[PDB]
Symmetry: D2
């Protein structure tokens, strides 16, 4: 049994809660009030930066060529993805400055600090595992609700969700999983706790997005 499948198995109860979270459900169904979505999208700036910080630390510690592959990903987050994000902000009548000036919630800061902290104290696999719930759950969620997406009345939501269903996104999850699954068999327990914590943060992030605070 591959490490990644084990992690998914041991965090099963939590992912079930992510899949059916009201924010997630309504976003994919199209019922989500645009304002709630805007609040979520503004909190995403901190998320994009945080993800980039943790990836920079992991790459700073990795062997070549992996460090090159990781740095490309970090670069894409604050480059290509920032452009897509600014483009999303436009559609919502918002600007990067609005995002930049948004105050991250405690959960937002906490989640990103958890990613950085794990990258700092842990080896390459531990750091990456702290980011897997993020990458993987976003793909699982869209797959889970794929049917509602086609029936979703809000063009902005359909465009947003289609990203996680794309082959490029899916290939990225595949790569991350592969790096982790091709590693040793020892220390699984540490990996399990890292993954679980990351999964709880995802659930908490969706919750704070819904509460608008």
């Amino acid at each position: 049994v591959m490490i990644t499948d084990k992690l998914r198995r041991d965090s099963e109860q939590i992912w079930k809660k992510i899949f059916e979270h009201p924010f997630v459900v309504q976003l994919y169904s199209g019922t989500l009030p645009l304002e709630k979505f805007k609040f979520y999208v503004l909190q995403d700036f901190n998320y994009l930066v945080g993800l980039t910080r943790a990836l920079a630390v992991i790459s700073s510690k990795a062997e070549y060529p992996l460090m090159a592959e990781l740095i490309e990903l970090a670069r894409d987050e604050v480059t290509v993805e920032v452009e897509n994000y600014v483009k999303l902000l436009k559609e919502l009548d918002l600007t990067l400055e609005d995002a930049i000036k948004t105050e991250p919630t405690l959960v937002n800061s906490a989640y990103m600090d958890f990613m950085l902290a794990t990258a700092y104290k842990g080896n390459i696999i531990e750091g990456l595992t702290a980011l897997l719930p993020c990458f993987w759950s976003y793909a699982e969620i869209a797959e889970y609700h794929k049917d509602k997406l086609r029936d979703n009345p809000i063009k902005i939501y359909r465009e947003w969700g289609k990203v996680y269903l794309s082959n490029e996104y899916l290939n990225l999850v595949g790569r991350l999983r592969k790096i982790i699954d091709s590693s040793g068999h020892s220390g699984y327990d540490r990996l399990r706790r890292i993954f679980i914590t990351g999964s709880k943060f995802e659930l908490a992030f969706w919750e704070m997005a819904w509460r608008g605070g």
Copy 2:
């Protein structure tokens, strides 16, 4: 106006919430069910270790003699304080192993990762500021409730609370504040955000301790 007094001022609404939190109030009054206290005390192990990790990082980056002073503090947490903690555990019919095997809540892990993460990306003053809510609020809380403490029927709670009223503890807070207050005038806003985040974590920690999860 000194940096530290400013931080206290800008996080005033939060600290009011900490002072009157049910866990805090009942602990100091003596009405706290022993079980809730035991749950809290078991979560303290992760807190002691996390505090030590963050201090280690801050010292690794500081100039001598401050690095020496900070490492002594880190050393004391995992040595002298572990002994006092084990002694507290005894009084509660618990063992270090019980503490070591306790699973930290998401808030616990989050708080410690915030401390480490801030120590890692920030300069010496930013790292220390991430720890000030911790050190300072524990002293302010006991001062605030000092009157109930002498009227507290539970010996274990009185012993626990007396620590934060002692001259040794108070001197430590004084030192920490001094280091921070003798620093530049620039970057106050980053310090403010760090302090606020740390204060919200304190409130969250008391809340999770009360909820037992």
Copy 3:
């Protein structure tokens, strides 16, 4: 009436930069007299440099505020992509492969210099981290400017291609930008910057020297 921080860094390291400008390896590389064998030893030692520069930039980036962080990760990214590609093309002209580079044992000097970069990025703020990298970026441009004439007249094509990179406007503008960042910082804490910059400058000299010694 106060000059800039980078003006002082150049000012305070003049003697060692002079030794760098006049180092046999450097002088011979730009004149075209360097024995092709010594250049290969140097190029080979460059892999570890390429990777090390990338590691340090990643750490500085991890601690920087946005948008500077993005500007820095882009530079780190280019070191290990665009530049690895160019490095491979250079290796080719010399009948060497990336494999040979990757397998090359870095001299003590090399390891040490890269460690100084990473260590400084880790313990200091971003200005201190970048200052640890300025001797690298800056001296390579100054060296080329210094031997500009000899280059435009160098018999060996590979050496010419190699050198021209540092005289380009893009490379010059990049170093300019790194200096702007350092110079727009606080007036205090100069002494720490000075020691960091001087250490980096010594490593640069040491690097040429070990490339000259072939060990």
Copy 4:
């Protein structure tokens, strides 16, 4: 039938450790022939070493699991407390003050070695970090063991006091413990450990050399 990891590290660095055991500075310090002036230059350069060893231990401890983290922070704490006190007493016997030490400019070799320690602690796991510190702790004990006889017969009291520290059971037990931690780790990844240990060993030799050169 497989020897231990630290057995291999000693095995793979035999030639440079021999040069360390036979280095003039080392040989003369233990025989009692070293000119007191050279010892002072060395002791002076030790402050930066004392601080650097402490920084690297702090980073390793910050990443370690409990209780190893506590064992390591204690060692870091002793470096900057008990040992600074001993170092001050030594400085005194030599008519020097901590102030003189703190104000001493560390040679490039010194800075580099400390940076290698910190950089290794930062990028690698705890075993790799500790392995970067083993040549330090271990070689000092082996050197004393190696020149044991010369020491018990050294004319200069300060040198004798200085040397005896490394023959004590406590010091020997500490190195023993550091080796036990490294040896109870995984069988794989040895090559990384080897390069780290060999780098550290070269720095040790370089350190004596710069102490001998006085620059």
